[PDB]
Ligand binder design. Structure first.
Ligand SMILES: C=C(Oc1cccc(C(=O)O)c1)C(=O)O
Ligand SMILES: C=C(Oc1cccc(C(=O)O)c1)C(=O)O
Lengths: 284, 281
């Protein structure tokens, strides 16, 4: 029987927002310490919660609903301070005309759709008729007055489709910034609590390798954008702007934003407004 | 917009150094990579789920009109290969009429094993395909043909522990013919190679560059990989340096002779043509 130690099963968001991180993981050789699974953020959250992964990215709302069973990694997250570029409301009408209107919510999103609902309800005071559908701007704009998108589809709407067809595109990071002055965290990295307690060292090594890979990806953002531009509808300048607009930090100012958002949506989402975010402790 | 080529990659240790090279060079970010066992990756490439990938030799020969092989990279050996074995509780000349389990992930080594047992040792066993599991196989058969990590484990660990004979298929072929052996090649679908000659060529050159780097850094790869395997650093470095990743004239010589000896009993012409990706003139 092969009872040797097993590589941690690690999720990775397939979208462009984590493409520089993937570059870092590859260049550092970290990938060879992982059994990597790539997918969309809602699938990766399901897999980690149900035990198909040991460590991975968790969209914030799903992390908070499972906070007792997950341990978040400090100093890395998928966030913004102001615009995030890839979490948007695309609308054919001004936001204040959306009361009773149809608003399509992309099915891959858990956090941005809730942030959009919070903003529309509690900031602009409109109550639209929401519905979930697969992310497809063309179909959404044929059947609804507005749509909430994330990931590459949202970046495409923001940078290409929106300007082409004269559609308003509202940046959810900027809308939240205007409303609260705060940055925003859309997704965190976490280990399952049982995996973190069974393998504290591997969990720590995975965490440190993520930080190192993230740091390298920041230094080489131009090389990453140059390479990725050959395979995307976005050009090199757009991708480098995107990669540098994203904020991958996760310290005290970012936790402050998570705390406030969790408070405003917890009771109507599925977790306490004062839900406890447990962070992976460093070696003392 | 242009789409990344869909590229297969054998999940076994034999291509872990190559994966290291693909990551370190950044080549991985030009691929949409799929990892699986060699028989699955071969099926996927033939049926169009991949554009470029490793193809176990026998399956390449059965589909040679529709595949274009990459020169100067392959999975082979010159003598022992370490991870393609016959594990037997009896000497090979005592296997006539006995049950021999063929690991289901193999297409080439199982045929090479059959060729050796019939035409070199002159025994005709009762073959059957089953999942690779040395323990279950040794309870249900007198011998078993294994590849990949399972074969490497049998050769380096399980065999010596339980006193089981383990025959290296590369060495048996070398003894019989004096030739090296090629177990798998890399190929592009012909339709993909003709639609995207530049991408196909860049993928090929990136594979060569990554392979070369993996040879240069074999020790770091072994040190890292040993932390996740039952094999230690010295065993992995020995394995990685015993594998022969070349694919030039002497290796094609071996493919030609093997194809000749098994074609009529496998499912392709004995003189099947191996088309190679041509470099830019
Ligand atoms: C930066 C983004 O923000 C995210 C990331 C992951 C999940 C979600 C979600 O809404 O569930 C949002 C992006 O999508 O690019
Ligand atoms: C070096 C090996 O040889 C192979 C590689 C790929 C496929 C096959 C097969 O038999 O189909 C054999 C190994 O398995 O490690």
């Amino acid at each position: 029987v092969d009872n040797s130690r097993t590589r941690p099963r690690v999720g990775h968001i397939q979208f462009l927002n984590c493409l520089p991180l993937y570059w870092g993981l590859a260049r550092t050789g970290t990938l060879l310490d992982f059994e990597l699974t790539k997918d969309t953020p809602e699938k990766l959250s399901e897999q980690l919660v149900r035990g198909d992964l040991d460590i991975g990215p968790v969209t914030l709302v799903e992390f908070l609903k499972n906070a007792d069973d997950l341990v978040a990694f400090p100093d890395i997250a998928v966030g913004c301070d102001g615009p995030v570029m890839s979490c948007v409301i695309v609308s054919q009408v001004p936001l204040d005309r959306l009361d009773g209107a149809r608003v399509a919510l992309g099915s891959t999103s858990r956090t941005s759709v809730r942030l959009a609902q919070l903003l529309l309800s509690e900031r602009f005071g409109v109550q639209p008729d929401y519905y979930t559908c697969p992310p497809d701007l063309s179909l959404m704009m044929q059947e609804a007055d507005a749509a909430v998108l994330i990931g590459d589809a949202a970046l495409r709407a923001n940078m290409i489709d929106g300007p082409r067809y004269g559609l308003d595109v509202h940046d959810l990071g900027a809308l939240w910034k205007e409303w609260t002055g705060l940055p925003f965290v859309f997704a965190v990295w976490a280990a399952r609590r049982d995996y973190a307690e069974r393998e504290p060292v591997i969990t720590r090594k995975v965490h440190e390798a993520f930080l190192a890979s993230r740091n390298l990806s920041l230094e080489e953002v131009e090389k990453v954008a140059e390479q990725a531009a050959r395979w995307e509808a976005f050009d090199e300048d757009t991708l480098a702007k995107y990669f540098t607009t994203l904020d991958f930090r996760f310290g005290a100012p970012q936790l402050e934003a998570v705390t406030e958002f969790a408070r405003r949506v917890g009771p109507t989402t599925g977790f306490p407004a004062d839900v406890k975010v447990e962070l992976l402790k460093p070696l003392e």
